[PDB]
Amino acid sequence: QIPLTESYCGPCPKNWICYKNNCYQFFDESKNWYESQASCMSQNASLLKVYSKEDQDLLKLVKSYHWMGLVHIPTNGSWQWEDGSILSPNLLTIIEMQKGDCALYASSFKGYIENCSTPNTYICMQRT
Amino acid sequence: QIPLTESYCGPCPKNWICYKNNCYQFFDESKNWYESQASCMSQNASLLKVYSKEDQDLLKLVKSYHWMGLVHIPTNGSWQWEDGSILSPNLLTIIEMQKGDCALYASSFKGYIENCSTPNTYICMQRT
């Protein structure tokens, strides 16, 4: 019946989810990947980025598929985040059943290749 | 490209999930319902209580089954929360496929009757 802790969680937008100082918001208003990235920025953010299984383990409980910021730019390149930031090793296991240059996040760190024009729900993220 | 908001989220235990001023924590260390309620209290809390689809809509994204504080006490009574607090109308849709006096929470406000002795993962909650 140990030392009770009690701390606030680093500024986040209003009514957003806060965890290990990262802010999340789950939008159910299905939109294509482009329209999707717009909403996030509109509220000053981007689509959910996966950078570490320790500070985002909550991510293991998400149900269904949702848009994240992983995209493939035909530069004869690899997959990356919409911000030019590099995907790191030992994080995501990617799945391919469709043709696409965008990806939906699935529970337990996995990316599903999906058409960027296909509407879907999405998750925005804002660090601190 | 509207008014950016930025607010902390009401004290919560350390590294817990914070949302609309309610604290959640997802434990993957499977235990029966009793052992389960003990952990939560141990950190000063109880198993996840559902009181409103507006302040707990995040709950719609939880995957799998998890222990919550809904139990049936044979007092020729109804289902209630471990704290004597009453379950309210128009919240949960209950499912029964097993014999039990405890319930697992399932995504989209639903309760599954389960044996209280059967181990399962659980979610603790602390209001503010």
Spatial CB neighbours of B93, under 8 Å, sequence gap ≥ 6: B109, B110, B111
Distance CA B68, CA A99 (A): 40
Tell me the residue type at B121: T
What was the structure determination method?
Answer: X-ray
**Domain range holding A55?**
1-128
Token representation of residue B106: 């399932």
Contact B124, B81 (CB under 8 A): no
- Give B36's contacts (C-beta < 8 A, 6+ positions apart): B27, B47, B67, B120, B122
Q: With residue A40 as reference, give the H or E element that holds it.
A: helix A33-42
Q: Which residues, including other chains, have CB under 8 Å from residue B1's CB and lie 6 or more apart?
A: A41, A42, A44
Calculate how close chain B gets to A76, using CA atoms only, in Å.
Answer: 33
β-pairing verdict for B17-18 and B22-31: antiparallel
CA–CA dist B21, A104 (Å, integer): 29
Q: What is the DSSP letter of A54?
A: T
Chain A hits for B4, Cβ within 8 Å: 13, 43-44
- Of B51, B3, B6, give the one whose Cα is nearest residue A16: B6
Mind spelling out the 3-state secondary structure of chain B? CCCCCCECCCCECCCCEECCCEEEEEEEEEECHHHHHHHHHHCCCEECCCCCCCCCHHHHHECCEEEEEEEECCCCCCEEECCCCECCCCCCEEECCCCCCEEEEECCCEEEEECCCCCEEEEEEEEC
Separation in Å, CA of B24 to nearest CA in chain A: 10
Cβ atoms of residues B103 and B94 within 8 Å: yes
Cα-Cα-Cα-Cα torsion A93, A94, A97, A98, nearest 10 degrees, comes to: 160
Pairing of strands A110-114, A102-106: antiparallel
Residues B32, B45: Cα–Cα separation, whole Å: 17
Indicate the number of domains in chain B: 1
Interface touch B18/A1, C-beta < 8 Å = no
HSE at residue B31, side-chain half, CA atoms within 13 A, is 17
Look at B20 and A19 and tell me if their CB atoms are within 8 Å.
Answer: no
Question: CATH number, domain at B21?
Answer: 3.10.100.10
| B120 contacts B66 by C-beta, under 8 angstroms | yes
